[PDB]
C-alpha cells in the first residue's frame, strides 16, 4: 500500500 | 472506472496522481497550505517516494524543511523513516538539511539508523554526517541501532568507521552494548563484543553490561559477555 498515515510515536 | 477526478490533493499527491494534484494548484490550491494534521503535500509525496511531484512541489515554491505533524519533523525526515534513499538523495540535492532534529529528538541519520535503513545510512555518513553524531536524546546510531535493529544491519556497517564504540547516551550512559542487552538483540551482542565493547563498563546507575544480563537470567548472554574478558 501507500503511506497515507503520518508517522507516530511508537 | 475511478478517474481520480473526485480525489482530494492529499490522496492524490499520496498515490502520486500527478495530473491531477497539477489541476488542484493551478485552480489555487497553495503547495504551502498544511491539512487538518499540520502536514504539507511535500511531507506526503516525500513519504511515498513521488519525485516527480517533489520536483514540481518545490518549484511551486513549497517549503524544503517545513516542520509538520504530530512528531514536528521535515519531509526529508519522512522520506528517512519510510526508506527511500532516492527521495533523501532528491531532497537533500535542493537543500533539505539532514541534521535538524525532530519533535522525538532526532536527526536523519538516527532515524535511518533505528528503522534499519542500512543504505541511507550509509549515504548521509558518505555526504558528511559523523557517524557518531549523538541525537537530544544523546543517542548515536549505534546505540539506535543496538536498541532497535535486531539484524546485523545497520550494525555492521556502521563498525566498519571508526566509532567510538564504548560511548554512553546522555541521560543513562548506556553504551551500544548495554542498549543490545537491554533490548535482547542477540544479533548486535556479538558484532559489539568482537568490535570491543566493554563488557565491564558501568552506565549511570553503576550497571554494566555484564550486570544488566546477569539481571535479565539470560544464560545464552552471560555466557558470551563473560567470555569476552
Known amino acids: 500500500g501507500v503511506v497515507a498515515s503520518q508517522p507516530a510515536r511508537v | 472506472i475511478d478517474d481520480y477526478s473526485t480525489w482530494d490533493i492529499v490522496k492524490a499527491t499520496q498515490y502520486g496522481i500527478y495530473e491531477r494534484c497539477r489541476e ?17 503535500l511535500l511531507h506526503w509525496a516525500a513519504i511515498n517516494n513521488r519525485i516527480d511531484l517533489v520536483k514540481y512541489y518545490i518549484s511551486k515554491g513549497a517549503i524544503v524543511d517545513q516542520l509538520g505533524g504530530d512528531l514536528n519533523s521535515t519531509p526529508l525526515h519522512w522520506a528517512t523513516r519510510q526508506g527511500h534513499l532516492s527521495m ?78 564504548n560511548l554512553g547516551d546522555k541521560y543513562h550512559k548506556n ?27 558501568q552506565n549511570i546507575k553503576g550497571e554494566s553490561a555484564l550486570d544488566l544480563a546477569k539481571q535479565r537470567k539470560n544464560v545464552w548472554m552471560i555466557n558470551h559477555l563473560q567470555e569476552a574478558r
Open chain 2, 24 to 40: 488542484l494548484v493551478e485552480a489555487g490550491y497553495d503547495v504551502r497550505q498544511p491539512d487538518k494534521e499540520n502536514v504539507t
Open chain 2, 88 to 165: 533523501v538523495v532528491q531532497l537533500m540535492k535542493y537543500g533539505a538539511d539532514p541534521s535538524l532534529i525532530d519533535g522525538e529528538g532526532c536527526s536523519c541519520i538516527h532515524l535511518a539508523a533505528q528503522f534499519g535503513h542500512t543504505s541511507i545510512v550509509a549515504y548521509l555518513i558518505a555526504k558528511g554526517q559523523d557517524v557518531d553524531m549523538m541525537d537530544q536524546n544523546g543517542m548515536t546510531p549505534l546505540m539506535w541501532a543496538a536498541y532497535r535493529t535486531h539484524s546485523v544491519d545497520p550494525t555492521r556497517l556502521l563498525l566498519t568507521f571508526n566509532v567510538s564504540v
Open chain 2, 175 to 201: 553504551t551500544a552494548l548495554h542498549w543490545a542487552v537491554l533490548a535482547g538483540n542477540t544479533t548486535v551482542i556479538s558484532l559489539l563484543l568482537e568490535a570491543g565493547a566493554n563488557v565491564d563498563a
